[PDB]
């Protein structure tokens, strides 16, 4: 579990969204695994306007930060689960690291700022929805 709050904003991986989120729906995308609603408190998280490849994520099942090397945003192939059939994931980048299903929602960072959130994994990969994209976050 876990979120990105910058300025009004609550940033969730979609699978994970609830009734609220749904409620105060801005924006959402099933193909990015990635969902954004309306908050009244403000957030202060900074979002990362940038290409770096190098950045520290968090990861829950070890309660620890970890140090990654990660691609580029693309679009990758991730296998059918209870919230989505099987499909091409956009805007997503991995990693070599840890992650169980639990971790999604652990941010990643770089010294600009936050980068993504975990939203896949598994065979000692871990994968990031990236949201340096959404310049639409800070206004
Ligand atoms: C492959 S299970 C796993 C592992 Br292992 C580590 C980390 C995370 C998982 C869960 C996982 O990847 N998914 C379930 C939730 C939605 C995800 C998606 N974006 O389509 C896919
Ligand atoms: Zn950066």
């Known amino acids: 579990s876990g979120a990105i709050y910058v300025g009004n904003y609550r940033v969730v991986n979609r699978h994970l969204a609830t009734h609220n989120d749904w ?21 202060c998280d900074t979002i990362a306007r940038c290409d770096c490849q190098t950045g520290v994520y968090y990861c829950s099942s070890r309660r620890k ?12 192939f991730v296998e059918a689960s209870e919230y989505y059939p099987a499909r091409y994931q956009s805007h997503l980048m991995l990693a070599v690291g840890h992650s169980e299903p639990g971790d999604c929602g652990g941010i990643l ?31």
């Open 65 to 76: 930060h970890y140090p990654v090397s990660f691609s580029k945003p693309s679009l990758i």
């Open 109 to 139: 960072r770089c010294q600009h700022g936050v980068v993504g959130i975990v939203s896949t994994g598994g065979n000692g990969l871990v994968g990031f929805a990236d949201v340096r994209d959404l310049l639409w976050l800070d206004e």
């Open 23 to 43: 409620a105060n729906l801005v924006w959402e995308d099933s193909s990015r695994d990635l969902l954004v609603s309306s908050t009244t408190a403000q957030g």
